[PDB]
């Protein structure tokens, strides 16, 4: 309840620490590996989130390294960071001061689901489009998030702005460097991870995004289950068993299936589900990792055409959030897509 003054380092640019005062600190929740507090900046009265993570005495903090590089309207901004000490000894905390966003896609989806109500497809379009932009941006640095789930999609439901958060699982993936998946990609686990791949790529995030889309269309997870084994049974119910070629594309080291055919995608979702949403989902939830759309290709899909209509508005009458403020970095995987992604009225 008292005023706390720290010397905090701005997230972006070289280190230029500033005195920052905040107050009204209270626990509001958690990320995967840190408690999240709300606080009010004394200067502007603005609410911020402070994620407190343990600082290793000998190793750099990877989440901080990644977040200092990022600046995108669909990724939670690292305003500042600072260190604090408990009474223990070697007990040091890294404090990440983040923009505060009050709700998540999961909360809105769960509200609609528990009410037996379909989430309006305009919101599905807006949320998924903004997720795909955030992925296009991080993937352009080689950074894979590895924990894409609806609880990590922050949302202001009135403006419909979505921000990806929680980079505690994220890593730069480099061709030829093996990677593991013990504490990450547990929520919507891509099948190559279930099959034990250590050479996986950022397309694991696109699989997760496909699971988010399917959940928003169905009102429940498409592949529920705690373990990868459990999720795989559920994956087979829809996709059938992977072919020998798909297994080789997922994990060429997987030595040790009956042929079970896929279930038609139109029969997975309720009648009246928009056909383009089903088409999009079928190009995300693919066994072969290289067959999945890239994030930028997904943004350009016909499912998002309504967002490119000149007269589109939110249901509350407000303008849509920013959709066309692309950068070179974000477009870098396929700059010619800019012609389609940004209609003439938007540039």
């Amino acid at each position: 309840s008292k005023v706390t003054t720290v010397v905090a380092t701005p997230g972006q640019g070289p280190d230029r620490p500033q005195e920052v005062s905040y107050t009204d600190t209270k626990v509001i929740g958690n990320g995967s590996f840190g408690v999240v507090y709300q606080a009010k900046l004394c200067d502007s009265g603005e609410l911020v989130a402070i994620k407190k993570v343990l600082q290793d005495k000998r190793f750099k903090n990877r989440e901080l390294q990644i977040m200092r590089k990022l600046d995108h309207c669909n990724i939670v901004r690292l305003r500042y960071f600072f260190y604090s000490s408990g009474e223990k000894k070697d007990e040091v905390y890294l404090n990440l001061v983040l923009d505060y966003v009050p709700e998540t896609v999961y909360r809105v989806a769960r509200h609609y689901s528990r009410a037996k109500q379909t989430l309006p497809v305009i919101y599905v379009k807006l949320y998924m489009y903004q997720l795909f932009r955030s992925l296009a941006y991080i993937h352009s640095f080689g950074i894979c998030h590895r924990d894409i789930k609806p609880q990590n999609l922050l949302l202001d439901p009135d403006t419909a702005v979505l921000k990806l958060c929680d980079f505690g699982s994220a890593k730069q993936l480099v061709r030829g460097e093996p990677n593991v998946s013990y504490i990450c990609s547990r929520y919507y686990r891509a099948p190559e991870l279930i099959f034990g791949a250590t050479d996986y790529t950022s397309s694991i995030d696109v699989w997760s995004a496909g699971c988010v889309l399917a959940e928003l269309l169905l009102g429940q997870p498409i592949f529920p289950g705690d373990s990868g084994v459990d999720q795989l049974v559920e994956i087979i119910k829809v996709l059938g068993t992977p072919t020998r070629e798909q297994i080789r594309e997922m994990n060429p080291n997987y030595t040790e299936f009956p042929q079970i055919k896929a279930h038609p995608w139109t029969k997975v979702f309720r009648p009246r589900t928009p056909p383009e949403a089903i088409a999009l989902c079928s190009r995300l939830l693919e066994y072969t990792p290289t067959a999945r759309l890239t994030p930028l290709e997904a943004c350009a899909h016909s499912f998002f055409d309504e967002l490119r209509d000149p007269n589109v508005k939110l249901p509350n009458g407000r303008d849509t959030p920013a959709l066309f403020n692309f950068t070179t970095q974000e477009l870098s995987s396929n700059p010619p897509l800019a012609t389609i992604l940004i209609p003439p009225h938007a540039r």
Binding site: G29, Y106, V108, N152
Partner: peptide, 13 residues
Amino acid sequence: XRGSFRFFESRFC
């Protein structure tokens, strides 16, 4: 409600 949530409270509870 029930499940795994980011925040303790929600207007959508």
